[PDB]
């Protein structure tokens, strides 16, 4: 995996300066766009290797692509692929809803819950499934992805847990309740980027302080079917809300499921 900071001009920061220390960057050796994560120094050398690490143990078509790292000598490179229409909450919000129809819609769930199957399967957890953390390419092409948005986001969409910062209208009771994190929480992060999707970007739960998300969803609250979200999708969306991380289906399941409606 290892690559000559030589095969690499770095350019400009990506989407300005929204994934923090990224870089719009070409591969010399194949005229190629890539994107590059950088760091700083700060001492967060730790997290940035372990990163690099479990990016070599996992590929799939539906998987940010890691193509190579540079951690040898500072600066601190690990270089994927670019992806030509950038995050899929934008995506979303900007696109051509004639082009972007249900059938879309479907095809970019599809997706998700294939990319995050294999996760299932080689025990990964994701922790931050989001439309925030997709990316699209022509074709409606979506990769799942992991920026590490919790400390560069700019507002109420991360809040502070103990010097950790949550998405809570992402995050699993179990989660939230006990600091429990696992595939089941990623399930139930998954139920609620599928009504982004269905909503076209929409911010879920909207309204509704953060502080009675909780105590909402311990009394039963659910958000509502969307306008024109086929049922099937939404009864799915309910199963990935179970209150119990162990009523929740699997993404294998979900994979199944959305496999055979895309039809
Ligand atoms: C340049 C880079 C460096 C690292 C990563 N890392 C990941 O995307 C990633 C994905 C999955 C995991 C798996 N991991 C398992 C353990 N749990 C806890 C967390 C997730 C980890 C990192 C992506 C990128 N890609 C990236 N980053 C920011 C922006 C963009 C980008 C933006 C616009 C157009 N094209 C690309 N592309």
Not at 66 to 79: A, D
Not at 90 to 95: H, K, V
Not at 110 to 120: K, N, P, V
Not at 158 to 182: C, D, M, Q, R, V
Request: hydrophobic content about 40%.
């Amino acid at each position: 995996w290892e690559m000559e900071r030589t095969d690499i001009t770095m350019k400009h920061k990506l989407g300005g300066g929204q994934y923090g220390e990224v870089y719009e960057g070409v591969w010399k050796k194949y005229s190629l766009t890539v994107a590059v994560k950088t760091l700083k120094d700060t001492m967060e050398v730790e997290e940035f290797l372990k990163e690099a690490a479990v990016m070599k143990e996992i590929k799939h078509p539906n998987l940010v692509q890691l193509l190579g790292v540079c951690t040898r000598e500072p600066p601190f490179y690990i270089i994927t692929e670019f992806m030509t229409y950038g995050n899929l909450l934008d995506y979303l919000r900007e696109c051509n809803r004639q082009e972007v129809n249900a059938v879309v819609l479907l095809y970019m769930a599809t997706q998700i819950s294939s990319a995050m199957e294999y996760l299932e399967k080689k025990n990964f957890i994701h922790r931050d499934l989001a439309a925030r953390n997709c990316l699209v390419g022509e074709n409606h092409l979506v990769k799942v992805a992991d920026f590490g948005l919790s400390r560069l986001m700019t507002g109420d969409t991360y809040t502070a847990h103990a010097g950790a910062k949550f998405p809570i209208k992402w995050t699993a009771p179990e989660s939230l309740a006990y600091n429990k994190f696992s595939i089941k929480s990623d399930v139930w992060a998954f139920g609620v980027l599928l009504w982004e999707i269905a909503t076209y970007g929409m911010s879920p739960y909207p309204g509704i302080d953060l502080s009675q998300v909780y105590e909402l969803l311990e009394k039963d609250y659910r958000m509502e079917r969307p306008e024109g979200c086929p049922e099937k999708v939404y009864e799915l969306m309910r199963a990935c809300w179970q209150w119990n991380p162990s009523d929740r289906p699997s993404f294998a399941e979900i994979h199944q499921a959305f496999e055979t409606m895309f039809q």
